[PDB]
Design a protein around this ligand. Structure first.
Ligand SMILES: [Zn+2]
Ligand SMILES: [Zn+2]
Ligand SMILES: [Zn+2]
Ligand SMILES: [Zn+2]
Lengths: 74, 73
DNA sequence: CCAGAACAGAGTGTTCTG
DNA sequence: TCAGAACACTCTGTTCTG
């Protein structure tokens, strides 16, 4: 059974280039195209799992990017 | 004017014993009375300010309590 | 002035569709 | 196969009332 490379939850398939859960899929699209105040309250090392993924959108987006998510050819 | 001792925002008065903004007032009553599953994603030192106070309710609650907030006062 | 109620929003996560 | 739309919810924050 397949696991999200970002938050560890159960993954539906490959989204924006990366094996991810549905919530990480849509969070990534929204973060890149949106305007948000995202600032880590930590050390930019926050644990991102299902229970805590809402805690630090800044670390979550970082994980999306470092995993290689992208919206396609520029 | 005066600053919230929890998140640093603009303080609306003395709530539950501590100089506090309005958001932190109701966050605290909800946190102490209800049931949540707050879990720190960090090292339990998270920065609590207006920009980030939503990030870590657990660190926020610890900070409210360390400041001396209580539903009795 | 302050506590609690009432009211409203941000951000999130799911179901549905082709 | 995966991307997008759009509703429903959770926690949150502000205005209102006593
Ligand atoms: Zn995920
Ligand atoms: Zn973080
Ligand atoms: Zn505050
Ligand atoms: Zn924390």
């Amino acid at each position: 059974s397949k696991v999200c490379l970002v938050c560890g939850d159960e993954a539906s398939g490959c989204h924006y280039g990366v094996l991810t859960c549905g919530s990480c899929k849509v969070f990534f699209k929204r973060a890149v195209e949106g305007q948000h105040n995202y600032l880590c309250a930590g050390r930019n090392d926050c644990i991102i799992d299902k229970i805590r993924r809402k805690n630090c959108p800044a670390c979550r987006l970082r994980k999306c990017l470092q995993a290689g998510m992208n919206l396609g050819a520029r």
